[PDB]
Structure 1
Amino acid sequence: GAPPIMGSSVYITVELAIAVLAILGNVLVCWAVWLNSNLQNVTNYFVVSLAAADIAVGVLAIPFAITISTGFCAACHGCLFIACFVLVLTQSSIFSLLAIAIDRYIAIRIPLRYNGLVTGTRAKGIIAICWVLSFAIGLTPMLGWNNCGQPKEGKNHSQGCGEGQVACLFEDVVPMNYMVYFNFFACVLVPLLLMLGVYLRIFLAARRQLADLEDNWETLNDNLKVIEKADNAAQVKDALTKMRAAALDAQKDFRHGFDILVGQIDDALKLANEGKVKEAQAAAEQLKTTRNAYIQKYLERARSTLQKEVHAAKSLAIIVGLFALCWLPLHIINCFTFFCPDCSHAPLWLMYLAIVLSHTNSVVNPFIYAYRIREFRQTFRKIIRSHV
C-alpha cells in the first residue's frame, strides 16, 4: 500500500483548514455578543459557551488530533489527555445545547416569570458547573477506565517507545466500552433525545397558545353575531356572560383596551338584566369599535411574538440536528467496532473522514446564526465592514 505520509498530509492539511475556520467563525460570534447589547441575553451566553468550546476545538482539539494520528511514543496518561480533551469539548457543547433548549422552553411556557427565574448570574453559574462536569465526564478515562494496564506490546517495541510509554493511538488507550456505553449512549444520545423532547414541547406550547388566541377571537365574533340576531334580553345575557369571561381570558395602548371592552360588556349586561333588549344590542355593537382600535392590535402582536419564537426555536433546533449529523457517524463506527467483533474494522480512510466530519461542526454554527438570526447577521455586517 501507499506511503503513510501522503494520506497523512491530506488529513493534516484538511484539519488545519477546519481549525482556521472554527477559530475565525466563532471569534466572530463572541465579538458580536460583546459589542451588541441586543445580543446580550441569557440565551446567547450559552451560545458564547458553545462558541468558546468550538474555538477550543480549533486551538487545541485539532492539534491534538494531528498529534495522535502519528502514533508517537508517549506516556499513557499523557496520551489519554490528548485522546480525551475533545470529549470535554463535546460534552460542554451537549450541556450548552441542552441549556438553550430548556431556556427557550421556560421562555414560552412562563414568559412573565422568565426574567425573574432566568438571570445572567444564574446562567453564568450553570456554565461554570457544566464546564467542571464536562472535564469530569470527558476525562473519566484518566481516572482509571483505560487500556494503559494492557498495553499493545508489539506496537510499543516496534517503534521503540520508552519504558512506561505506549504508541499513542486512540483505540489502544481509550476503551471502546467507555466510548459506546458511557460516552455515546449515556452522555450524548440521552441528552440529544431529551433535547428533541424539549423542542417538540416548545412547538406544542406554541401551537396550543396560537390556538387559544384563535379561539378567543372567534368566540368574540360568534357571540357578537348571537346578540345581533337575538329574540329576547335573556339570550343577550347568555352571549354577554360568555363574552365577559373570554374578555378576562385574553386579558391575562394595551390595558386601556380591555378596560373599555369589559366596561362596554358590563354596560350591555346591566341593560340586559333590566329587559332593555334593543339598548343592549346597540351597546354590544359599540364593542366593534374597541375590537378594531385595541383588541385586533393585541392579537396581531401576541401572534407574531409566538411566530418569532417558533422561528427562533427552529433555528436553534437545526444546530442540534447538525451536531447530531456531524457526530453520529463516528459514534456509529464505534458501535460497529464494539458490537460486531466478526465484522472487519472500518477502514483507515473512513475513520479519518468521520473525525474530520465531527470537527467541521465547529465551523457550522456561525453560519446558521448569520442566515437565521437577523440580529447576528446585522452585527456580523457592522463588524466586517468597519473592521477591514
Structure 2
Amino acid sequence: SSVYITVELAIAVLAILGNVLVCWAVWLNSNLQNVTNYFVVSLAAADILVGVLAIPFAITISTGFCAACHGCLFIACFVLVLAQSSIFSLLAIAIDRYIAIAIPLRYNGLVTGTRAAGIIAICWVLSFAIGLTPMLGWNNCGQVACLFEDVVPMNYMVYFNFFACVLVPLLLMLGVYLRIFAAARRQLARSTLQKEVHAAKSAAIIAGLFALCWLPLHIINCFTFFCPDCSHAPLWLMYLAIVLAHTNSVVNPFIYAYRIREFRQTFRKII
C-alpha cells in the first residue's frame, strides 16, 4: 500500500537523478562523446521518462483511477514504449561493440554519428508503435475503470510484447555478446584490446541487469495467461515484480560510475 508508493517514489527520484547526471556527464566531456555513448544517453533518456512518467502511471494504475478508455490505455501501456526503447538501445550497443571488436579498422567507416542518431530516431519511433499497439487496436476495452488486467489484453503482453518484442531481441543480443567475447578471445595492441573487453563487459552487465529485472514480470504474466485454471499471482508478488522491473532504471548509472573511470571522474567534477 503506502510502502509500494514510497518505494516507487524513491526509485523514480534515484533514476531521474542518476540518469540526469549521466546525460550531463556525456554532454560535458568531449572524450565521452563517442558513438556508444549516444546509445547510452538514449537509454538514459528512456530511464529518465521511466522515472518521471512511468512510475506515477503505475501508481495511478495501482489506485485504480477511472478515466476514458484511450487515456487508460495510454496510462497502462506507457511503460512498454520505454522498455522497448531500452531493448533497442541495448541491442544497438551490442551491435556497436561487435563492430568495434570484430572489425576495428572499419568501425569508424561503418559506424558514424549521423548513422547513430538516425538509428536512435528509428528505434524511438518503432518503440512507440510497439508499446502503444493496444491503443490503436488489439484491445480488450469491452469511463472504463483502469486495471492492467482488464484494459490491456494478456495475449498482447504474453505473445507480442514478450515472445517477439523482448525475447527475440534479448536472444539476439545474447548471441552478439557471446560472439563479441569469442572474437576477443580469438584476437588475443594488447592494451587497446583489453579496453574493448572492459568496455564490452560494462555493456554486457547493464544488458544482464535488464533481463534480470524485466523477465520476472513477464514470466508471472505468462503463468497468468497460459494457466488460467491456476490462481492469479498474489497482489504483493505482483507489486514486487513491478518494483523489480522499475528498479532496473536505477542501476546502470551506478554501473557506469563503478566500472568506467572517465564517467566517475566527470561525475565527481559535476558533484
- Do Structure 1 and Structure 2 share a fold, with TM-score over 0.5? yes
Alpha-carbon distance in 2 for matches of 1:142, 1:11: 27
Alpha-carbon distance in 2 for matches of 1:361, 1:383: 23
Query: What displacement does 1:38 show?
Result: 0.8
Give a deviation string over 1:5-53, Cα, whole Å, max 9, x none.
xxx2111111111110010000000000011111001000000000000
Alpha-carbon distance in 2 for matches of 1:67, 1:359: 15
Query: What displacement does 1:149 show?
Result: 2.4
Size of the aligned set, in residue pairs, is 271
Query: What displacement does 1:371 show?
Result: 0.7
| 2:254 counterpart of 1:367 | yes
Alpha-carbon distance in 2 for matches of 1:309, 1:72: 49
Alpha-carbon distance in 1 for matches of 2:14, 2:244: 14
Given the two structures, how large is their TM-score scaled by the length of structure 1?
0.69
Give a deviation string over 1:196-240, Cα, whole Å, max 9, x none.
1000111111111119xxxxxxxxxxxxxxxxxxxxxxxxxxxxx
Query: What displacement does 1:345 show?
Result: 0.6
Query: What displacement does 1:309 show?
Result: 1.2
Alpha-carbon distance in 1 for matches of 2:252, 2:123: 20
* Aligned twin of 1:342: 229
Query: What displacement does 1:335 show?
Result: 0.6
Query: What displacement does 1:59 show?
Result: 0.7
Which structure would you say has the larger RCO, counting Cα contacts within 8 Å and 6 or more residues apart? 2
Alpha-carbon distance in 1 for matches of 2:254, 2:106: 32
**Aligned counterparts, 1:1-388, within 5 A:** 8-149=1-142, 166-210=144-188, 303-384=190-271
Give a deviation string over 1:151-191, Cα, whole Å, max 9, x none.
xxxxxxxxxxxxxxx11010101111110110011011110
Query: What displacement does 1:323 show?
Result: 0.3
Alpha-carbon distance in 1 for matches of 2:97, 2:151: 40
Query: What displacement does 1:147 show?
Result: 0.7
Alpha-carbon distance in 1 for matches of 2:259, 2:176: 20
Alpha-carbon distance in 1 for matches of 2:64, 2:13: 24
Identical positions, percent: 97
Post-superposition, which runs of at least 4 consecutive aligned residues in structure 1 deviate over 6 A?
none
Alpha-carbon distance in 2 for matches of 1:187, 1:208: 32
Secondary structure, counterpart of 1:210 in structure 2? coil
Query: What displacement does 1:375 show?
Result: 1.0
Alpha-carbon distance in 2 for matches of 1:307, 1:14: 39
Secondary structure, counterpart of 2:213 in structure 1? helix
Give a deviation string over 1:250-302, Cα, whole Å, max 9, x none.
xxxxxxxxxxxxxxxxxxxxxxxxxxxxxxxxxxxxxxxxxxxxxxxxxxxxx
Given the two structures, how large is their TM-score scaled by the length of structure 2?
0.98
Structure 2 runs not aligned, ≥5 long: none
Query: What displacement does 1:128 show?
Result: 0.6
Secondary structure, counterpart of 2:67 in structure 1? strand
Alpha-carbon distance in 1 for matches of 2:262, 2:8: 31
Alpha-carbon distance in 1 for matches of 2:267, 2:204: 21
Query: What displacement does 1:315 show?
Result: 1.2
Query: What displacement does 1:330 show?
Result: 0.5
Alpha-carbon distance in 2 for matches of 1:180, 1:91: 14
Alpha-carbon distance in 1 for matches of 2:269, 2:66: 48
Alpha-carbon distance in 2 for matches of 1:186, 1:320: 18
Query: What displacement does 1:378 show?
Result: 1.0
